[PDB]
Amino acid sequence: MNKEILAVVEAVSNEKALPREKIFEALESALATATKKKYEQEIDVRVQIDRKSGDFDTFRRWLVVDEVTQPTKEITLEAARYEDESLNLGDYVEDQIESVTFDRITTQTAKQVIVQKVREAERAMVVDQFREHEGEIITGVVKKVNRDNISLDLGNNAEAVILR
Amino acid sequence: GPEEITADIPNVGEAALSKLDESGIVYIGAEVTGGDILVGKVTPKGETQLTPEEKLLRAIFGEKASDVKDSSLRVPNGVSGTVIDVQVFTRDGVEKDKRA
Amino acid sequence: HYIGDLVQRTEVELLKTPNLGKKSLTEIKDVLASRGLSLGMRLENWPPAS
Amino acid sequence: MNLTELKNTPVSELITLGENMGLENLARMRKQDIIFAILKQHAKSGEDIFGDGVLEILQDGFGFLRSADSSYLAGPDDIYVSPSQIRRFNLRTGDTISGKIRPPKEGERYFALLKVNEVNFDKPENARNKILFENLTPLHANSRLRMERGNGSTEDLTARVLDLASPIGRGQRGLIVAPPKAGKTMLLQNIAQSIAYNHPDCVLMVLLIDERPEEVTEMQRLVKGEVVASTFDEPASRHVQVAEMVIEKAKRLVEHKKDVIILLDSITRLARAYNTVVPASGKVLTGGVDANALHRPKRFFGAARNVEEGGSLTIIATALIDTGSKMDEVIYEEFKGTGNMELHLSRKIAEKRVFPAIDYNRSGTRKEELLTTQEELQKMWILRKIIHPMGEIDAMEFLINKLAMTKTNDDFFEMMK
Amino acid sequence: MNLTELKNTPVSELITLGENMGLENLARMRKQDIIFAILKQHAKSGEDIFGDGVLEILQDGFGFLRSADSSYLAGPDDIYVSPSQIRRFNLRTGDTISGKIRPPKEGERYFALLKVNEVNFDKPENARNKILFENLTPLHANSRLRMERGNGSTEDLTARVLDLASPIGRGQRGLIVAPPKAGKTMLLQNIAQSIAYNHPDCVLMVLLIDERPEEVTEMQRLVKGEVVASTFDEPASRHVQVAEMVIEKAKRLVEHKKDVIILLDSITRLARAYNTVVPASGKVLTGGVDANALHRPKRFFGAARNVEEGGSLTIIATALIDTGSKMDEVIYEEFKGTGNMELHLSRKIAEKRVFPAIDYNRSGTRKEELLTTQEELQKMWILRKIIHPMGEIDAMEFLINKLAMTKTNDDFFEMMK
Amino acid sequence: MNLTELKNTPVSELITLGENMGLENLARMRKQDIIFAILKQHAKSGEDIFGDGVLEILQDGFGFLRSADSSYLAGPDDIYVSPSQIRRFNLRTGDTISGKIRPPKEGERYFALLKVNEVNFDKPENARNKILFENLTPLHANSRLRMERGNGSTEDLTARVLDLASPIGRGQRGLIVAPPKAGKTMLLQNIAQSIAYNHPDCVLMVLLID
RNA sequence: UUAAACCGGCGUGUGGC
C-alpha cells in the first residue's frame, strides 16, 4: 500500500532530477488521470498523498466557472456559502474520500507520467546546459524549417528554436 | 512473458467487471446474455529492448507492461446461458489459482 | 417530486435545499446532469404539455 | 456556548447538563468527549455556538483552535478553521480567536469556525495591519518587576532574595540552574503568586513540561492565570507542540503590546525532546546530542525579548544539573551564553534543610542598572560587597536568618541601616 | 461454577472431579484444559455457569474475561463477551465482571457471557454512571501507610527502615533503584507481607515481570492477595498485555474508590519489552532505544496517582542499574523525573553480607510532610541530620545494629531518647 | 532603486511606499519581504533597478549579492549573478558589486544583475588586473593607530589603557582573553567609537557572533 | 510543423434437406 509507494520513491534513480516533492506531485497527477478512468465523470482530483507522513486522500476540484456541464467541476463566481468556503476562485472541495486504491491501470498511469516527468527533468537539464550564455553569439545547425519557426541544434542534444 | 488471468482489465466499464470474482472467473450460477468478460486473460505485448529505466520502473510497480491486450473469451454473439460448472487445468509447475 | 418544476430550479436552490451536503449533492449532480439534462433550464410550456 | 465555560467546572455539572440535553449516558465517555457531545447537541438546538481558542497551523493551510483547558493539545472540540480565514486575516500561530462555529456534518471531523468576532481581545482590523514579532526591535529590561509580597511570609523571602540577589524585569531572559531535590517547585510557585498578587497587570503564563500529574493539578489551581502543561503522558511530539504553541501565543500577545511571563520547568527535558525529534546528520556531539538539535531550542529560548513599541516577553526556564551524564550539562552550557539573566540554586545547602538555597555568588543580571533605582543600586552593590568575602555557608545562613528577622526588603535596608 | 473456585485447588481434585463428570482421561491434557473440559461438561448438565474475569478489549469490539489465576493471559476458559454488553454498559479494560455464561456450540470458540450480575463488586448501575480514571484529579499522598510489622522480626527491620528512611503512602509513585544481587526480592516480599498484615484494608496487588518460575511460585503462595505474573516464558507481547491489563484493573478499582498497591519488579524489563514492541521511527537514541519507545512506559508509570474523590493507586516499580550497557540506565534516568518517590538500594554494601543495604542518602519523598505527623517529622529531620555527616558504611552499620537492637520504630525513637 | 536605501529606514516608510506602489497589504509579510515586493513593483514600472551587494559563490558557479543590512545572509532580495560575469571579471567572494538588475520572471528565483557598474567603489578595469590577497606580502604593524579620544571620558580611559598597555596598529592580529562577566562588550564599544572618531580614515567593521 | 474526428485454408467424420 503506502509502504510500497515509499519504497518506490526511495528507489527512484533520479532523486536529484525528481526529489520527493516532484515525485508525490507526479503521483497527484497520476491519481487524477486514474480517477479520470475510475468514474465516467471527468473530474480533476488532487489527492495530496502526503508522501513523508502517510498515504493518499482523494479530493474534488470545483473548477470555478459559470457553466454547469460536468457539475462535479462547476461552481459559479460566488457559490461559497456552504462549507464556509467564502472564496470565489480556487475554493475546491473534498467530497469523495478514499476512492479506488492503486490497481494495475493506476500503476500504468503512474509509470507513464513518471517517465515523461523524467523526460521533463532531462529537458530542464538541457535548459541548464544551454543557459549561462543568454545574450551571447552562439553557433548552431538547424534541423527543420517551418512557416512560423525553425529548429536548431548545437550538439549534445541541445535543441532550440528561432521564431518567425 | 507468460499468460495470466489477472482480473484487472484495462479500458473496460465497471458494469462488465461486476460479474467477475477476485480471481477473474465468474461465479457458478451467474447468467450471461451478451458478450461479457468471464475470463480475465490480459497479458503484456510490449517488446524488449526497453531502456533500464523502463524495466526498473515496471519491476518496482509490480509486474506490469503493455498489458492492454484484451485477449479475453466472451460468449459468442447470439447465445445466452447460465454457467453451472467451471473447469481449469494447470501445467505442472504453474502456480494454481485459488479457484482451482 | 417532478423535475418539470425542478427544470425551473437552477443550482442556487441546491445547497439551500435542506441537508444537501457532500455525497448527496454529489449524487444529485451526477445522476441528473450526466443523462443529457441540465440542472435548471428556463421554459414556459410545461403546464399545457406544449 | 464557550467550551472553557463548560471546562472550568468538573465532569459532574457536564453530566447533568448532558442529561438536560437528553443524550446517551455521558459519564461513560471522557469528560472532554462529554463536552464534544454536549456542544453537538447544543448545535442541534438550532443555534450558532460561540467558540474560542489559539490557532495551530498544519501543512495543509487550515487551522485548529486549541483550547486553554485542554493544555493546547489535540481534542474533539478543536475548532476547524477553513483556509479562507488565513487568506483574509492571515491569523498566525498563537492568535487567540473567538467567533461563531457550526456543528460537524457527518463524515466531517470537528466544528468549523464561520466568522471571527474577536482577535486577541481586539478588533479584527488590528490583526491584518500589525507589526510582527520577529520584526520587532529587541531591548533590555527597562521596567522593574518587584517580587516581594509585602506581608512577610516564610516563603515570601524566596521572592525577596531574588530582589536582593538579582532583580527581574520585563523582557528579561532568566535561567534557573539547579540540581534535582533543591526547591525549584515551591520557588516558582511563590514567584508566580508574588507576580500575580503584587503585579496583576501583567499576564501570568506558568508552564510545566514533563512533571508529575499531581504537580500539574497543584499548579493549575493554586496560581492566577492560565496553566498549560504537558507531563510525561505525552511524547516529545506533543511536548514540542505545546511548547511552540505557548511561545507563539506569547509572541502574538507581545505583538498586541502586552507583557507575558513564561515560567518553564524544565528546559533540559525540552532540549531532550528536541534532540529526540531532529533528523540525524550522521554525527553526534559530546554527550550524545545531534548537531542541529540546538537550533530550535535556541529559537524557543531567544523568543523572549523587550520591545520598543509595546509589550514584553520574559521567560524563566529552569536548567537541570547533577544528572550524571554530559548531554544535559551540555544543554546548560549552550544556554548560559544565550540568556542574559542567570540564577543558580544550591542543593549542597538544600540537603542541610537550609531553604531557600540560592547561589548568591554566581547569580547576576546583565544591565542590572536599568532594573533598580540609583541609591538602591549603590546599597545592593555594598551588600554584595559584604556578602562576598564570607564563606558560602556563612553568606547563606546570614541571608536566611537576617531576612527572616525582617519582613520586607526596604525594611531590610532600613534595618541594616 | 466459578473457574477460580476450580483453580485454587491443584490438578488432582480437577482430575477426580472430571472423573465424576465421566469424560475422557483428564490428566493427559493440561490442567487449565482440564478446567475447560470440566466446565463444558458442567454446562452439558443443563445449568447456566457462573463465571468471572477482568475484561480485555480487542479491535473488533467484543471482550475476553481473563481469569486471575491464569495470570490475565489467553486461555480456553476466557469468557467471550458480546459487543452488546459494551454497548449497554461500556465495560472498559480491567473491569472485574461476574455473570451467567453458556457453553460454546460447535464451530464457536469459548463460553459466552449472557448477563452481567456483578460489576467490580458493585451493582451494574454504578458502571454506566461513574467518573473515569484519567478524568480524576491527581493529588499527593495524604494518608500514611505504616510499614513496620510490630513483633520485631529480622526482616521486619526491612520495613522499619523505609518508615525511617522515607515514608510510603496511598497514591504515591515509588521507584526502587538497585543493581542485581542486592536484595530486592526479599525486600518486596516482606513489604507485601507487612502491608497485608498491618493494613489489610487496602488491596494488595503484587506484580512480577520476567523472573524465574520458582520465584513466581514463591510469591503467589506466600503473600495475601492476587499474584499475577508473566515470566520469560511469555514474549514482549504477553508482557505488555499483562502489564496494561493489571494497570487497567487498578484504574477501575480506583474509579470504584479503592486503594491499589502495585509492587512491580522490574520496570527495566518492561521498558525493554516496550522498546521491542514499538514501530521504528528511523532513528535511535543514546543506548539503543527508539524515540516513541518511552511514551507508553511513561503512561503506565504515571497511571499511579492519589484521588480527591476516592481510592488511590500506589506503584512501587523496581529500577535496575549496573547492567553494563546504557539503555537500561537511560530508562532509569527517564524514570527519576516522573516518579515523586525514590528509594535506592546498595549492592556495594550487599556484597559485604550487610542487609538491608538501603541508600539512606539518595532516598527521599516529595511532600513528605503529608506522610508523617509533626513531631515525628521533626525527629526524622534530626535523625537524618545525625546520619548525614558520617560515612556510608558508618551510617549503614549504625542503622542495622541499632535497629536490630530495637524492636519497633516508636520504641526506637524512645530509645534514642 | 538601492535596497539599502530602503533598508536604512524602518518598516513604516516601507509600508507607506508600498501603499504608494498599490500592492497587497504589506505589513502582513516581513519587512525584507516588503522590500522584495516593493522592488518587484518598482521593476514593474518599466525601469532598471540599481542594486548592490557583496558576492557569495556557490558550487554551481553563479553568485548571490548579499546585502549589508541583511547581515550578509540569505534573503529574497539577494541578487542573482549569472556565471558570465564570473567568466568576464571573475569577481571573488566579498567583492562589493553595484549594477543594473532586472525583476525575476515567473518560475525564476530573484533579481538578476545585468551589467556591473561599480566594483569595490572603483572602475571594473581594476577588478581583472589586480594582485590577490593570499598573494600579498604580509608584514608587521608600521603605522600606529592611536586609541584615546581626547576629551577625557570615563570609558575614554578604556582606550588610553590600551595605548598605555600595548599599542594597536594596522595589520595587527589582536586577541582579547577574558572570562564571562568581565567587561568586553563596553570595551569593544568604546574601542570602535574611538577608532571611528579619532581615525575616521579607516573602515570600521565591527563583528558580532552569537 | 500544430489542432480536431474515425479506424475458414485443407482434410476427416456425422447428420439433415
Ligand SMILES: Nc1ncnc2c1ncn2[C@@H]1O[C@H](COP(=O)(O)OP(=O)(O)O)[C@@H](O)[C@H]1O
Ligand atoms: N523555601 C522553602 N522552604 C522550605 N522547604 C523547602 C523550600 N524550598 C524547597 N523546600 C524543600 O524541598 C523539597 C522539594 O524540593 P523540589 O522543589 O522538588 O526541588 P527540585 O525541584 O530541585 O527537585 C520539599 O520537601 C521542601 O521541604
Ligand SMILES: Nc1ncnc2c1ncn2[C@@H]1O[C@H](COP(=O)(O)OP(=O)(O)O)[C@@H](O)[C@H]1O
Ligand atoms: N533483609 C535481608 N536479610 C538477609 N539477607 C538478605 C536480605 N535482603 C537480601 N538478602 C540477600 O540477598 C540475596 C537475594 O538477593 P536478590 O533480592 O535476589 O537480589 P536483587 O536485589 O538483585 O533482586 C539472598 O541470598 C539474601 O542472602
Ligand SMILES: Nc1ncnc2c1ncn2[C@@H]1O[C@H](COP(=O)(O)OP(=O)(O)O)[C@@H](O)[C@H]1O
Ligand atoms: N567602566 C564601567 N563603568 C560602569 N560599569 C561598568 C564598567 N565596565 C563594566 N561595567 C559593568 O559590568 C558589566 C559588564 O557587562 P558585559 O560588558 O556584558 O561583560 P562581558 O563583556 O564580560 O559579558 C555591565 O553590566 C556594567 O554594569
Ligand code: BEF
Ligand atoms: F528533582 Be528536581 F525537580 F529535578
Ligand code: BEF
Ligand atoms: F537479579 Be536481580 F533480581 F536484579
Ligand code: BEF
Ligand atoms: F561574557 Be558574556 F557572556 F558576554
Ligand SMILES: [Mg+2]
Ligand atoms: Mg522540582
Ligand SMILES: [Mg+2]
Ligand atoms: Mg530480585
Ligand SMILES: [Mg+2]
Ligand atoms: Mg560580553
